[PDB]
Design a protein around this ligand. Sequence first.
Ligand SMILES: Fc1cccc(CNc2nc3ccc(-c4ccncc4)cc3s2)c1
Lengths: 18, 307
Amino acid sequence: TTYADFIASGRTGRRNAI
Amino acid sequence: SVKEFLAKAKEDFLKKWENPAQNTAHLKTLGTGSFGRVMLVKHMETGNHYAMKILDKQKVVKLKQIEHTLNEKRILQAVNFPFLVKLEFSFKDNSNLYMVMEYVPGGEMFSHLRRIGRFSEPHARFYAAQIVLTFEYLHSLDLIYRDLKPENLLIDQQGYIQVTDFGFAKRVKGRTWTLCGTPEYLAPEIILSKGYNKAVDWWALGVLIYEMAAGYPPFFADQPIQIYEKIVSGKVRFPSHFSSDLKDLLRNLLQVDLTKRFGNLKNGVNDIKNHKWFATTDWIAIYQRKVEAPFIPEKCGKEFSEF
Ligand SMILES: Fc1cccc(CNc2nc3ccc(-c4ccncc4)cc3s2)c1
């Protein structure tokens, strides 16, 4: 699912600016 | 009376912007960064609690953050809006820069959103209306925000939003070119190395609305470069629980084409405020915070002369 894909991305935590 | 409010707000802004307030005071840890930390402090004379940002002047210079730091404090001391943090005091000493601001105890929208999963559409709309008004305010001052995301939105004791950071904000009338922001929240024109304007904040609003209502952003991947590819393709898929009104609003915000993006058309912000998804939104009551919230929780002297 899209939810499982989100968890798999490793980008579920606080995101830094580039 | 929005035109009259915004003309008086611009008068109030420019006066403070042109003659910034300096040295308005004298000297638990809530967080840390590469050039400083944020502490919960108590003002001795009143017993009032505030958040104090302590910035190491040497570390600011080393990390090439002089202009961003001077600019952020300059904006903070000049703005006045219900969803923008109130800067109480600012001062410097031999070693550090200090910004004493309102303490926002609720923490980031980010934590509440990951905990709850996703927000219901009325809940997402309550926050989205506050961002609409804030960008309308900022954009009227020629201020581009450029770092909208749940991580940068504090929730106060009344359940309303508070914006504290302006690290990437820039006061510019036309185009700007800096590659800055967070990968998920980048408009396609920032990724494509072209000149861009305030419409990037309206793209970011689209990303924010989608993330609050879905629980995940419209474009994600394991690496930023793979996220940029999805953004520039603009292929957005919506969860089946998204209402017809939401999908339509998001199609218009997450518009690759600038001549079609909501907020960047002749009617401006009014294309967003008058959208069907916002029909039940009382814009004046949001501003007044009368709507009941759905959720209630000497070193480097030359470089910092203006601070
Ligand atoms: F000093 C720093 C330099 C560079 C990066 C960082 C990143 N860390 C943090 N930034 C903030 C900003 C505001 C608040 C805040 C304000 C008002 N009320 C409650 C919290 C807390 C934190 S913790 C800090």
